[PDB]
From Swiss-Prot:
Transcription factor involved in the control of neuronal proliferation and differentiation in the brain. Regulates dendrite development and branching, dendritic spine formation, and synaptogenesis in cortical layers II-III. Binds to DNA in a sequence-specific manner. This is Homeobox protein cut-like 2. The gene is CUX2. It comes from Homo sapiens (Human). It is linked to Developmental and epileptic encephalopathy 67: A form of epileptic encephalopathy, a heterogeneous group of severe early-onset epilepsies characterized by refractory seizures, neurodevelopmental impairment, and poor prognosis. Development is normal prior to seizure onset, after which cognitive and motor delays become apparent. DEE67 is an autosomal dominant form characterized by onset of seizures in infancy. Later onset of seizures in childhood may occur in some patients. It is found in: Nucleus. Residues 18-105 bind DNA. The chain holds residues 1028 to 1125 of 1486 of the full protein. Belongs to the CUT homeobox family. Signal peptide: none annotated.
Length: 111
């Protein structure tokens, strides 16, 4: 048999990116930007689109992010916000699938 009582439950969270980022380990901004660029180049993707759909960033802002990332320590949680989404977007196996699907097929542009 047994007797007594033990265990518990009853907690929740608000959610949101900044709380994922809060819990995050040191996400090597450089190595992520590197791997992210290389994923864009492999798939011949355009930096902006990734920045729009994933990061909510202007192309100026995304291209600066990839070009010269600040270190994780320098970045506040709002600083780390995009790089966390990049780390997870690298791990997501249908990441590029959903990203191409934004553009899908389009009509002709230039010659």
């Amino acid at each position: 048999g047994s007797s007594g009582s033990s265990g518990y439950s009853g907690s929740q969270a608000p959610g949101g990116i900044q709380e994922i980022v809060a819990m995050s380990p040191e996400l090597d901004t450089y190595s992520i930007t590197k791997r992210v660029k290389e994923v864009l180049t492999d798939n011949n993707l355009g930096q902006r689109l990734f920045g729009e759909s994933i990061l909510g960033l202007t192309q100026g802002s995304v291209s600066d992010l990839l070009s010269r990332p600040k270190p994780w320590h320098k970045l506040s949680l709002k600083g780390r916000e995009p790089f966390v989404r990049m780390q997870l977007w690298l791990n997501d196996p249908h990441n590029v699938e959903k990203l191409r699907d934004m553009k899908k097929l389009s009509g002709p542009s230039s010659g």
